[PDB]
Design a protein around this ligand. Structure first.
Ligand SMILES: C[S@@+](CC[C@H](N)C(=O)[O-])C[C@H]1O[C@@H](n2cnc3c(N)ncnc32)[C@H](O)[C@@H]1O
Ligand SMILES: Cc1cn([C@H]2C[C@H](O)[C@@H](COP(=O)(O)OP(=O)(O)O)O2)c(=O)[nH]c1=O
Ligand SMILES: [Zn+2]
Length: 418
């Protein structure tokens, strides 16, 4: 079973309001071999709570990281969107903070090592840390040195001893996946020199609330983060938030730079600005999260009836992409193989498998192109621009997409938008 949250990860208080509860839900990245039955499929409570002190949003429970990540088989996206964004991460880190060539960049949750590869092409020394054994072996094979472990205070000390002081420590979409964020902050503090930086990229709570991105709630995602809660945490570990960049990726994200409290790096005014913006948009008030809650109920209900209505008219519907978040979407909406006949997905490992809970089949794009699908529910909506850009033939044939946020809508729209 999953361990229950007592006190807050960031600020250490214990005072939260309930925001939404989806009950027991199977793990979003636990895809299944098809056929037979699925009686023993594990399910865990999926509910979110908001800490009234620092306003970290968090799941009620913490599924064991060993279970989640040790055989995590899914590689970093090889999409043009992510290739470009990884190049941008390098650019921002190097150019904004003046990291010279030959500097050392450590990455937490480095996966297959593609982000590090880009840092190596910019002339940097690198090292990865990722517990997915399979994936770490691929990175190591490719020539990108990766320790096959979770990040910790002791692994941090092993890195310092063997590899030295990093000019940059990077964690992309991994900081929200770690329960003991205090230990990370400690390992980081020990690692950083006077002008070293700790940069983390996470989905921005402001964007999640405003665009009603409830499908981004899943067990892997323990935290849902704003700038406020991070300052609260780093205060308690001799670390200080020095800069933030808002990004379009993954439905609205923040790339947060953190340095030693008593180090070289000055705090930029942007940090205060975003903290003021968070207050100004109701993040410290109960109503905001009750409003989120009904938006979810509204979107969930109108998404299912929209799907079931179209099916009743004799239209065929499939899912486009089989991302982790799509499995929250379809489980919460209670959709099944009768509603979506398959989900197409470019991930070879996923092809031939079946989705968690809903048990919808996952098929290949080459198969999908042989089927007369009228609507695709766009589950990988964070890649909307890239996806729509290569689906001209489908759209030209009168095919349509259903987007789940900010509100359910049909692409193409009825008129040209300027
Ligand atoms: C969703 S992925 C992020 C992959 C990559 N950073 C990206 O942005 O595409 C989460 C990755 O972090 C790894 N991970 C999870 N918990 C970790 C921890 N405590 N320390 C280091 N890596 C971790 C997982 O094995 C997985 O490869
Ligand atoms: C960009 C793109 C992604 N996909 C799929 C590949 C991935 O399995 C999924 C995107 O998942 P992603 O959001 O990158 O991560 P996660 O594995 O946590 O969901 O969508 C397509 O099928 N076609 C596409 O054009
Ligand atoms: Zn808190």
């Amino acid at each position: 079973t999953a361990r229950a949250v007592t006190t807050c990860r960031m600020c250490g208080a214990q005072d939260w309001q309930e925001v939404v509860d989806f009950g027991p839900v199977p793990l979003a990245d636990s895809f299944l071999e098809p056929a037979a039955s699925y009686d023993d499929e594990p399910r865990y409570p999926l509910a979110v709570v908001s800490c009234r002190s620092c306003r970290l949003m968090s799941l009620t429970h913490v599924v064991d990281p060993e279970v989640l990540y040790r055989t995590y088989p899914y590689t970093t996206s090889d999409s043009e969107t992510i290739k470009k964004h990884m190049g941008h991460v390098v650019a921002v880190c190097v150019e904004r903070f003046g990291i010279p060539e030959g500097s050392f960049v450590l990455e937490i949750g480095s996966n297959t090592g593609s982000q590090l590869k880009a840092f190596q092409n910019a002339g940097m020394r690198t090292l990865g840390i990722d517990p997915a054994r399979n994936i770490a072996a691929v990175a190591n094979e490719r020539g990108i040195e990766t320790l096959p472990e979770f990040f910790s205070v002791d692994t941090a000390a092993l890195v310092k001893k063997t590899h030295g002081t990093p000019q940059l420590v990077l964690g992309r979409h991994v900081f929200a996946h770690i329960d003991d964020v205090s230990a990370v902050a400690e390992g980081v503090r020990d690692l950083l020199g006077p002008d070293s930086l700790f940069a983390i990229e996470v989905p921005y709570l402001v964007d999640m609330l405003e665009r009603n991105e409830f499908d981004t709630i899943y067990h892997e995602h323990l935290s849902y983060i704003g700038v406020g809660s991070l300052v609260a945490l780093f205060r308690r570990h001799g670390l200080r938030v020095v800069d933030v960049e808002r990004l379009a990726v993954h439905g609205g994200s923040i790339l947060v730079f953190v340095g030693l409290d008593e180090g070289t790096r000055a705090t930029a005014p942007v940090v205060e600005e975003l903290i003021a913006l968070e207050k100004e948009r109701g993040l410290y008030e109960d109503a905001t999260y009750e409003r989120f809650a009904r938006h979810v109920a509204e979107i969930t209900a109108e998404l299912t009836s929209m799907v079931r209505s179209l099916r009743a008219e004799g239209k065929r519907i499939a899912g486009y992409g089989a991302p982790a978040k799509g499995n929250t979407l379809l489980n919460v909406c209670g959709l099944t193989a009768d509603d979506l006949e398959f989900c197409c997905d470019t991930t070879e490992f996923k092809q031939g498998l079946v989705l968690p809970g809903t048990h919808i089949p996952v098929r290949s794009p080459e198969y999908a192109k042989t089927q007369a699908i009228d609507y695709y529910l766009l589950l990988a909506w964070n890649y909307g621009e890239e996806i729509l850009a290569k689906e001209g033939p489908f759209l030209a044939d009168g095919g349509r997409f259903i987007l789940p946020n900010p509100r359910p809508s049909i692409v193409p729209p009825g008129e040209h938008h300027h």
